């Protein structure tokens, strides 16, 4: 039925589910369905289809590049199938292997993580992200190491981690967002969380992940961006101001002080950008690849029609 | 042959003459005898024949042809290989040629800024194409150029980017320093690209280019099909026999940001996939 | 007064412009009525008078004998005041400032490496006088010279310096990339140096400077006592009223190595005490 309007509805008022297998269980959900029972016309009505509810569901709020990256995927599936070509059963049944497949991003991604962590060893981290989390978690049956977490982005949602961790682990202290560079001199090995990373190499994440990463290529310690699968964006880094998300600045200034509020111009980013020439790794689903590689594991995945 | 190729290029305000001898090798690879292996080898000798003259380019496109007539032994056959099905396969392969230039500006389009001051130390062909569509879609922008001193041959892009109707200012080529304050995104084409993601072009590219990663301002460059060579410098005075008497320069694949091709957008250090893709 | 001061540099083949202008208002300044404090003011607006014409050194001078002059207030008296004792005292002055290059070439020769190429973007006076005199009793070495764009002048360098019989090559200024892998020991003489201990030259002088501090040689710079002013930029395009017309470029004291003047070898960060203990 028309529950995907609901839920291009749901899409549009916000209201996030943490983008821990909610956009792409739901995309694969409502992918699934329309997939399961529609119009039927054996020359890609079908992939017309999709490309319909696709550029009515990339219609949302232009941020959550999960919903049409796992659409983009669904659509090179449905490319080599044909490729390879009943048709329903086999594109719904390796839909379903992608599925699976994607049912397991967070352990496999935190299994290789004795081998980088090692005794003694100051790590950094800014923001909170499930994966890093995860990550950062089955490195607790190795020695205690420290943890620098940076109390950063009003609303500064940096802290729950910080709890979730040190009642479970290793000695994390709280820095402000303004002290990372009186620390970053005592440091190694910084590792981020990614909002969403690009055909380029770029990641775009959280609004204090620049002017950290600067710190890094200027003392030379290199920064791992802990990032699965289905988050490789195309699209190389053309619109502009889009790339964001601008909230309220009531989270920045309150609404009290008045008359101040009349001639004075409040700014409130939610992301920002990182450029590839300064990423030293991506610890990845799959492999460990480098930044300069990134390019072909795209086109491993999609097709020529990303747009 | 010499003056078939040079009849070609005669009559072309376009086309550039690295592709004229594609065209020329492939009208004089058409009437000739011999349609055995070693016959190739003639044409080989028609390779060096058609590289006498300069400019890198040509020797591209020589080895380019070469491997793609040379690619014919495969799927083999006797007096009527398909090569014969690559002079058809290969008019499609000089028109798919022919086509380049206009994916490559409708992929560039997007990169400019709106309010751009545009570099650019030259006088190209492509860089023309793809810049007289942007401003026939799309915003404003200025264009700084400074003039290379044994051609001058940026006042022909002052002329004729006059003639696109956008505000030009063009200083010489010793103040590019003073220059680099007030620009960003310096565009430039270029004549071959080496097996790292290097480029040479002009006399002077090095001399903006180790300017551009200390300002921290992009450095984009953008070229056709035919620029992949197999050869591979390592520094300056290595380059071979291509030149007050130097023509050419280089730079350092440290420096190149995103280039542009007609296999589509592409990265520094993806270049030597797509050639060892080919070449073995 | 112009034509008393072009007449003085007209016939000289050495000296200051900077000097002639010194030894113009020394002259000027002595046949004129007025012993009184504010009659200097009439030669202030002589000052203006004489900075009629560029020349950024002239207005360094015009502070520089406006300083010298207007130290004679302290030491008061009445219509014989000690200005007088600086008309041999500046005369004195002015044949100190006349025996300054000697010294500064006395002190430079020795850095020159035995079998060094040495490579300046100029046509300078004492650049000569000092190589001059590191021919005439020292080793042997090449030099690399390119010409200023608008004026051609390095190859007035090229001419004089083969009359010192020394082995000179001269490129283009467009590929001095080109050059500095081949090259070490950059020698530079500059116009005016700024407060923190920059250098304003010629119009090509950071497109090489840039590229200096990039494959690691040395940069130096060598000038008189005449080229401090109070100026104190900051970026390009805040370069004062002084310039396809751009004349001088702006080099930041953060390239600048070990500079040599009159007062003796110099480090680019000990410029401020000189003038600080001056100025104040
Ligand atoms: O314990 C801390 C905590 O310091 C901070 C934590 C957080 C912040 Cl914001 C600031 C400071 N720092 C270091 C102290 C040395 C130790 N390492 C050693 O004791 C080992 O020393 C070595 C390691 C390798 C070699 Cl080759 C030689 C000595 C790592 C942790």
Redesign the interface.
Known sequence: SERIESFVETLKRGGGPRSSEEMARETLGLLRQIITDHRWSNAGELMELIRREGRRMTAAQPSETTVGNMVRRVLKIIREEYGRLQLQSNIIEAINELLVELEGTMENIAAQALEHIHSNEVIMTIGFSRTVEAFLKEAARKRKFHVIVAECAPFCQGHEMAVNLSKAGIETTVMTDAAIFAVMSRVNKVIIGTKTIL???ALRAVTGTHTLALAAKHHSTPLIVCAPMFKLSPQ?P?EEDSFHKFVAPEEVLPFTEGDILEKVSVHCPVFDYVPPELITLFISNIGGNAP??I??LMSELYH?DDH | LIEYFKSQMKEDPDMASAVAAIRTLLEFLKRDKGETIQGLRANLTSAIETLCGSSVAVSSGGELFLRFISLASLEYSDYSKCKKIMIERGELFLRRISLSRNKIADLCHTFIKDGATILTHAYSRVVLRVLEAAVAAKKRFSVYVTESQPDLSGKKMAKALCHLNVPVTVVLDAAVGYIMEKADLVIVGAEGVVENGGIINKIGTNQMAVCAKAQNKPFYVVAESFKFVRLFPLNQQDVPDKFEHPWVDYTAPSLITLLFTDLGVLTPSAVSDELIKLYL
């Open positions: 055909a380029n190499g190389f053309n300069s590689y390019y072909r020529p």
